Amino acid sequence: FSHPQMPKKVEDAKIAILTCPFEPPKPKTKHKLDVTSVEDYKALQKYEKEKFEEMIQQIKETGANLAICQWGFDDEANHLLLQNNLPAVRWVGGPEIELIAIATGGRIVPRFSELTAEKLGFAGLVQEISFGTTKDKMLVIEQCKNSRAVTIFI
Amino acid sequence: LSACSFTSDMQILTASGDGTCALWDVESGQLLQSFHVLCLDLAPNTFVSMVWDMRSGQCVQAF
Amino acid sequence: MMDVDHQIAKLMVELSKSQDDEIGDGTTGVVVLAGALLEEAEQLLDRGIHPIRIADGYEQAARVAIEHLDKISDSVL
Amino acid sequence: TNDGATILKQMQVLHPAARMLVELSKAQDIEAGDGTTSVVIIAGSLLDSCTK
Amino acid sequence: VKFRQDLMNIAGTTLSSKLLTHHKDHFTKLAVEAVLRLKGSGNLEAIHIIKKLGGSLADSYLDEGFLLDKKIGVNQPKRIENAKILIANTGMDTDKIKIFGSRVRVDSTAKVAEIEHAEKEKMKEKVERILKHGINCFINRQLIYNYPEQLFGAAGVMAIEHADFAGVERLALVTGGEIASTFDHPELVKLGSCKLIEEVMIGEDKLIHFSGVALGEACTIVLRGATQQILDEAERSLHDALCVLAQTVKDSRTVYGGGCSEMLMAHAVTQLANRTPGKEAVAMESYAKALRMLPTIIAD
Amino acid sequence: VVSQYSSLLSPMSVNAVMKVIDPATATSVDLRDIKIVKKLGGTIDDCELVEGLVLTQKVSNSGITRVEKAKIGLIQFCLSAPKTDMDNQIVVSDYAQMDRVLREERAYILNLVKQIKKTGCNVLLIQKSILRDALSDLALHFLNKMKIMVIKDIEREDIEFICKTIGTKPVAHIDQFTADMLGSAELAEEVNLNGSGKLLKITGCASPGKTVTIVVRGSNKLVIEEAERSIHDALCVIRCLVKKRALIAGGGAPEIELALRLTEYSRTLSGMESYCVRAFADAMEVIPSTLAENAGLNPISTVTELRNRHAQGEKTAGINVRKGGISNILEELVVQPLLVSVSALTLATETVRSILKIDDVVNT
Amino acid sequence: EGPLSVFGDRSTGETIRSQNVMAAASIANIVKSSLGPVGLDKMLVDDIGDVTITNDGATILKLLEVEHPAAKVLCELADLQDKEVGDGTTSVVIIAAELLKNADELVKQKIHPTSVISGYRLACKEAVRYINENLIVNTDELGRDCLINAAKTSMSSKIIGINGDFFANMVVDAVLAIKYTDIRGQPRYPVNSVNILKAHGRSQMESMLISGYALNCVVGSQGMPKRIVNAKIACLDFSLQKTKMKLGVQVVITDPEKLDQIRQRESDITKERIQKILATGANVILTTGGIDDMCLKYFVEAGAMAVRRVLKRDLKRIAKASGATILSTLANLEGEETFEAAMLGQAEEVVQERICDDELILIKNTKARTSASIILRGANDFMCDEMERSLHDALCVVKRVLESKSVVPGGGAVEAALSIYLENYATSMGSREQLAIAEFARSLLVIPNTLAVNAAQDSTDLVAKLRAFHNEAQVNPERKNLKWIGLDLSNGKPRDNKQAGVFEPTIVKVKSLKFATEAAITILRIDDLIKLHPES
Numbered sequence A: 001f002s003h004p005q006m007p008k009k010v011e012d013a014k015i016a017i018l019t020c021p022f023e024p025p026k027p028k029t030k031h032k033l034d035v036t037s038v039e040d041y042k043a044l045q046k047y048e049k050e051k052f053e054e055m056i057q058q059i060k061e062t063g064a065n066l067a068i069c070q071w072g073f074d075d076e077a078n079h080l081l082l083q084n085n086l087p088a089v090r091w092v093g094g095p096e097i098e099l100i101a102i103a104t105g106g107r108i109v110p111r112f113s114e115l116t117a118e119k120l121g122f123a124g125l126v127q128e129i130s131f132g133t134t135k136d137k138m139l140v141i142e143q144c145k146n147s148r149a150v151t152i153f154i
Numbered sequence B: 001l002s003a004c005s006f007t008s009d010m011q012i013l014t015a016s017g018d019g020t021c022a023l024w025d026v027e028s029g030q031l032l033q034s035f036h037v038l039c040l041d042l043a044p045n046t047f048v049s050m051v052w053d054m055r056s057g058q059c060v061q062a063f
Numbered sequence C: 001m002m003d004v005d006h007q008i009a010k011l012m013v014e015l016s017k018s019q020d021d022e023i024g025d026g027t028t029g030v031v032v033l034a035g036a037l038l039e040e041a042e043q044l045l046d047r048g049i050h051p052i053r054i055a056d057g058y059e060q061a062a063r064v065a066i067e068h069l070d071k072i073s074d075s076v077l
Numbered sequence D: 001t002n003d004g005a006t007i008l009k010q011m012q013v014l015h016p017a018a019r020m021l022v023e024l025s026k027a028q029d030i031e032a033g034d035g036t037t038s039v040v041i042i043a044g045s046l047l048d049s050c051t052k
Numbered sequence E: 001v002k003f004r005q006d007l008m009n010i011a012g013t014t015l016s017s018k019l020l021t022h023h024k025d026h027f028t029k030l031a032v033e034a035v036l037r038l039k040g041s042g043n044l045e046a047i048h049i050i051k052k053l054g055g056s057l058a059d060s061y062l063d064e065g066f067l068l069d070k071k072i073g074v075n076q077p078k079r080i081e082n083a084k085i086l087i088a089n090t091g092m093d094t095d096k097i098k099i100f101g102s103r104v105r106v107d108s109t110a111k112v113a114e115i116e117h118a119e120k121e122k123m124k125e126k127v128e129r130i131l132k133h134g135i136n137c138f139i140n141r142q143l144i145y146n147y148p149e150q151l152f153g154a155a156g157v158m159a160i161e162h163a164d165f166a167g168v169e170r171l172a173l174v175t176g177g178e179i180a181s182t183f184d185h186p187e188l189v190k191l192g193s194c195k196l197i198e199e200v201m202i203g204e205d206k207l208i209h210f211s212g213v214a215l216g217e218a219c220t221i222v223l224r225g226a227t228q229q230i231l232d233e234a235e236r237s238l239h240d241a242l243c244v245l246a247q248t249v250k251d252s253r254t255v256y257g258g259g260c261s262e263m264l265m266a267h268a269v270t271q272l273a274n275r276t277p278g279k280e281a282v283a284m285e286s287y288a289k290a291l292r293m294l295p296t297i298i299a300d
Numbered sequence F: 001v002v003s004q005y006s007s008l009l010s011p012m013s014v015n016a017v018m019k020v021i022d023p024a025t026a027t028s029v030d031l032r033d034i035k036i037v038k039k040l041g042g043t044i045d046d047c048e049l050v051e052g053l054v055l056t057q058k059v060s061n062s063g064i065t066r067v068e069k070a071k072i073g074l075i076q077f078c079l080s081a082p083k084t085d086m087d088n089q090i091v092v093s094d095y096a097q098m099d100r101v102l103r104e105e106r107a108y109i110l111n112l113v114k115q116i117k118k119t120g121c122n123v124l125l126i127q128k129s130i131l132r133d134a135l136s137d138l139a140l141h142f143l144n145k146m147k148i149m150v151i152k153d154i155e156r157e158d159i160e161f162i163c164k165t166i167g168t169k170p171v172a173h174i175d176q177f178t179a180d181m182l183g184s185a186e187l188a189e190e191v192n193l194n195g196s197g198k199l200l201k202i203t204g205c206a207s208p209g210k211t212v213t214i215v216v217r218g219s220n221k222l223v224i225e226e227a228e229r230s231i232h233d234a235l236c237v238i239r240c241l242v243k244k245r246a247l248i249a250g251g252g253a254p255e256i257e258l259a260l261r262l263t264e265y266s267r268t269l270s271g272m273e274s275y276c277v278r279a280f281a282d283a284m285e286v287i288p289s290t291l292a293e294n295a296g297l298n299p300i301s302t303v304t305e306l307r308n309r310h311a312q313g314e315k316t317a318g319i320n321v322r323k324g325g326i327s328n329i330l331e332e333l334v335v336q337p338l339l340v341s342v343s344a345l346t347l348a349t350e351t352v353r354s355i356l357k358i359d360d361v362v363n364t
Numbered sequence G: 001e002g003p004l005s006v007f008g009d010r011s012t013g014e015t016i017r018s019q020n021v022m023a024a025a026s027i028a029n030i031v032k033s034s035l036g037p038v039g040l041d042k043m044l045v046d047d048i049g050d051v052t053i054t055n056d057g058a059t060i061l062k063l064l065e066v067e068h069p070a071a072k073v074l075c076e077l078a079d080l081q082d083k084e085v086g087d088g089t090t091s092v093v094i095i096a097a098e099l100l101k102n103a104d105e106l107v108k109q110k111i112h113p114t115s116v117i118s119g120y121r122l123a124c125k126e127a128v129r130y131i132n133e134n135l136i137v138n139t140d141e142l143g144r145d146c147l148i149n150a151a152k153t154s155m156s157s158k159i160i161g162i163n164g165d166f167f168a169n170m171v172v173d174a175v176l177a178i179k180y181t182d183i184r185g186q187p188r189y190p191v192n193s194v195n196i197l198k199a200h201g202r203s204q205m206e207s208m209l210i211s212g213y214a215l216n217c218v219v220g221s222q223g224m225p226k227r228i229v230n231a232k233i234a235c236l237d238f239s240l241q242k243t244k245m246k247l248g249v250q251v252v253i254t255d256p257e258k259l260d261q262i263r264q265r266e267s268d269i270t271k272e273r274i275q276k277i278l279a280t281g282a283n284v285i286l287t288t289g290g291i292d293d294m295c296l297k298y299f300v301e302a303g304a305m306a307v308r309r310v311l312k313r314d315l316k317r318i319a320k321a322s323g324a325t326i327l328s329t330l331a332n333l334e335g336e337e338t339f340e341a342a343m344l345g346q347a348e349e350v351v352q353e354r355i356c357d358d359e360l361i362l363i364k365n366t367k368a369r370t371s372a373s374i375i376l377r378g379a380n381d382f383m384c385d386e387m388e389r390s391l392h393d394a395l396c397v398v399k400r401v402l403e404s405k406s407v408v409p410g411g412g413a414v415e416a417a418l419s420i421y422l423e424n425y426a427t428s429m430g431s432r433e434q435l436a437i438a439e440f441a442r443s444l445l446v447i448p449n450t451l452a453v454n455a456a457q458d459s460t461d462l463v464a465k466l467r468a469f470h471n472e473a474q475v476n477p478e479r480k481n482l483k484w485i486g487l488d489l490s491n492g493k494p495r496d497n498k499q500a501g502v503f504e505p506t507i508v509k510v511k512s513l514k515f516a517t518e519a520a521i522t523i524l525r526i527d528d529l530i531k532l533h534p535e536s
């Protein structure tokens, strides 16, 4: 889990699979945004803050209990996720993202505006697993309804 | 010293045969965090040597 | 039989050869005794005593020991 | 220098026991600041007695 | 009480072989208290071991609170009683708006100065939002630049900066605070608490001391030694003792040492071998022979 | 090596330690509060104890080298053209905008300097700045025209020391630069060390809070380094006295008494450990032997005489180099804190015990 | 090697002491031949054919390539004496080496080095006290003759010694020219404000003392006049060039019509600045920055001089001498861009003088302050360089004499008197300090011995006669006038050096004694050397 103070065990998790980093949007085309006055600076600051709040609210509106991202996120998004009782994991690889989507029966959502309740996955138990005196953690997603994918832990 | 890829000019990425890259900043001059090396390419808040994340201080993608 | 290079080692070898020549027995006791004497002289020198004084004291003690050996000797047929 | 800790640090001793003595002098300097020469001599004398 | 006695015995047996056997009793009490302060958590990283050169090995101790090896700001107070901790992971250092494609493009330096004043006002408003929580101390994971430091000093608030991820996690565990990154909801963020914060003199380095902590589920063990090698070996021995104690806390089943377990297992193996025909009996006997060889080496 | 200068350095070191601590409360001394400055030239007799702050930086002004009743102020921002944290550019599309930019920059710098001057500040310290010009030519000219001493490139690590010394609160934005952030001082002068360099000394302060500076001078580099090391040793001795308030005699007296009493104790430890305790005592006998040997006396006779005198009943008896024999060492005022000897014994014994547990060497 | 196990060499005991004494003696013997009026200069080839001919000890020891640390100590001692006093650089090295040699001789006799160090310290303190109490002459009793004699003594042993009758007057006039007073009324003589220019050509007697300042620069453009009668000097610290916007300013053109106006203003800004400067009546304009061709044309049309790339220290000296003011920028406190006549310096003439196919600017008779400058003429560059070094020594000596108004007799008189007094006084202090002080007194005799040896004369009998004279002066209260008896190297006979005009500043002897004693103590304090092998 991204924030160390998040709960280590989630039951009946409604997983939301996302491939958009929880950061302010960025055009792919070479772009420059011009700030020409103090009002422009204030508008930009408010825009960033409202983008963070809006993305968190959009995630929370679907009723999800767990958010899985692929590209990571920054401090404000992490603390908002912790503050709204939304455990999350970041930097999940692409193959692992699609495996989670298959196992949990949830779709892969490329941006928050397209995230709905029907695209949410489901898992009976999502837990963080320790391995003794090694400070290494590994997330486990299991107890899915009709998981079409399996993993072997040796 | 092998790699001294000056970055976002607020930060400096430096590395050598030690094997642990170091993140410095110009103004303060304080080592922000030493990531547990010959290349220090940045994002074409993250860089690759193993991809590291500023926001978490850990390797995020290995290849 | 040893192939030594240090001069003091050669002195020890010649001491054993002398003991063998005059007596024929005790060729190992002399080396151990000399080593012990020099080992004690090491700390004596470290305490700040001129080595000539150490040698003179060793000679006096050796004279005393030889006299005592003559005293406690026993004769055989 | 006459300082024992500086003398020990400046010359690059190679034997592990000498390195430990250097660290001992450094620790004595840290805790007290004087006697950095006496402590090493005391340790050497203790080990010399340990020989016999 | 019997479990505490078992923890004592296990820590003593683990430390018997190592260099800490000189002060086995003191170090056993030290390690047992350090493990028990975790309140059943397995986080061995919550126990911080600080190695300070000089002093005797018996001078090592477990601080009743927590020790931080960071520094306080310039004009900020050096001592706070009944502290109200706020642990954060924010910028506090020329935090540019995260729209990387943005830039300032004007036609006069007066506009540039106005934008600079706007940036400074944004930092000031951020500091005011932080101070709205009603705090005395502020620990940030990242760096704090001169302007926020001056604002904190004028507010009479300690601003400990550059406390890394481990540092902020340990502070949150020991004081009960919440590692925040936004300050628009002061009522939704829990604040850490402790009776006293001050600076202590350990050897020749100055450290920040947290006393009378609230939760205390994080320990700082100070190691004093005569050489760096002694300090490293003491750290390794304490790591072994803490690991074994944590494992025993996780699983309380215990077996007797001093070769007793090896003798019992080897006796069972020999009993099995006496009932087995063929060369498998010889292999079993060799297995038991190795099991006996273990305490044989111990006695050797 | 600084023993003919002891009559100068020892009171200097005692005063330096006592200035930075509270005698009624302090249990330890932070030696970082006593800064030592090395300047080549002169002799060790030229060492001084500065009650104020000594800076090695050069005054950027010309002709303003002495300020009386100074009002020093620290600046952590830059006195140059405005430059936001974001990427900033100025776009010129008309010819009038050129001299408009010039005039507006001049007005901005002038406003900054006027705001600084209105507070009454006359000595300005500017923190070292990278990626931005801390001091501009316009800023320097304007400050010179208003009779303000300017010292730039102040290191970031010295801010705390300067603030504790002269009582200045650092200022990072011109908005908060007010009178109460200044630190008054009787004199701020840049002195000349007889052609061996220049030092800026700010002596006299309204609130001289627990900080002192020592200027070390010498003929060549080597004696200067050794003088600094010796002064540090003296400060550490006074720190030891501050920590544990116990004084013990010197000149080999503690080692002789320790060897005698440990031999007596070993005689009551019948068994196999008695030999080890005897060896311990004979090893502690070494320090007085070295003391006698270095003085040119006879080590054996001097050591045995000292041991006999200690056994007679007097414990403050040791090697007397001035007289050349054995005498009551307290008459020569050769004393040292007990902490030094206790720490020496404890650390040496721990190191020996650690070494005795090693029985193999493995090459990695 | 052995049980110590250190990767390097180690010398202990008498070996390292002898090595240190050998190194110090080598350094002393390098420069021993260049002491006193009968001394000789030296050639120093710089491995690529560069030749340096000098008699100054500091220059010789600085140009040499030394490796032994105990010898680097003496070289740095000479450099320190040069920096802090300016004279007696060879004497201090010689005295320190002799002190170290005699101290090691005592140590070899099982005298502890601490006793020798204590004796040396006591002897140095007593020698300083005796010099300050008995061997000083007040300059007010003599006048300008004392300064002239001190300068002439300074030029002795130098390439300009024979021409001392002229060079001493030149030095004294130059020093008195730059005299200024500060707060508390202490007169200060800021040497290094006398610019010294070297230009081969005519004989040494053709050296000129400029009543003003000499600039080693030329006018930017050939079109300007090369002589102004009533100069109005304006000093600038910025370049007079085409205006270019800084890094933070960018020119973006969307309407093509504005480009011509922008490019016009790009030079009109500098044109307006130059017009503002010239409108106040300035005739000579000196700037540390560059000047393009169009600005030079403006100055040509205005009929005014303009010198570019002027050194900053030269500009500061010009501003101080002429009463001008350095202006790094044209910006008043009203936010405008002005230049009023109050910043203009004045001079009675500015000339583009020609000196041996080279031209330089002569600013003559600056007002509001008198300045000085010296142009040295010689056979070649080596002569001019040695002249500059000797002239600097003379200026330093005159500065010391004018600041501290006490002088001492020269020619080894002080050394002999100190030797006699110290060997007499050693009988009262200590038992081994007696020997230490006696050896200090004997070591002080190396200066007259070297002076006598250099003159190819019997040193033994001359030093004996000098010692007898000083002993009679010390033991007979009625013959106290014999304290001034020194050495006359021309005839090899004792001579009253006070009436002979052979003087030195007291600070020279005092600082030489203190520095040499400290260096000898520092070297003598070593008894073991560890030389770690290089890592490569």
Ligand SMILES: Nc1ncnc2c1ncn2[C@@H]1O[C@H](COP(=O)(O)OP(=O)(O)O)[C@@H](O)[C@H]1O
Pocket (backbone or CB within 6 Å): D004, D034, D035, D036, D037, D038, F250, F251, F252, F291, F319, F320, F321, F332, F334, F336
């Ligand atoms: N004047 C003196 N007379 C006799 N003994 C002295 C005198 N000064 C110092 N000592 C002794 O010399 C020993 C060594 O002190 P020193 O060399 O200054 O530092 P360190 O203890 O680090 O070697 C001390 O134990 C002290 O007792």
Ligand SMILES: Nc1ncnc2c1ncn2[C@@H]1O[C@H](COP(=O)(O)OP(=O)(O)O)[C@@H](O)[C@H]1O
Pocket (backbone or CB within 6 Å): G034, G035, G036, G037, G055, G056, G057, G086, G087, G088, G089, G090, G091, G092, G153, G154, G156, G157, G409, G410, G411, G412, G447, G451, G487, G488, G489, G502, G504
């Ligand atoms: N005219 C003179 N007659 C006799 N002795 C002189 C005369 N001029 C100088 N001396 C002596 O010669 C000594 C050597 O001076 P010198 O070597 O030229 O100075 P430095 O040591 O700076 O090179 C001086 O101590 C001085 O007393």
Ligand SMILES: [Mg+2]
Pocket (backbone or CB within 6 Å): C025, C026, C027
């Ligand atoms: Mg036999």
Ligand SMILES: [Mg+2]
Pocket (backbone or CB within 6 Å): D034, D035, F233
């Ligand atoms: Mg000491």
Ligand SMILES: [Mg+2]
Pocket (backbone or CB within 6 Å): E013, E014, E015, E017, E240
């Ligand atoms: Mg074990």
Ligand SMILES: [Mg+2]
Pocket (backbone or CB within 6 Å): G087, G088, G089, G154, G393
């Ligand atoms: Mg001279």
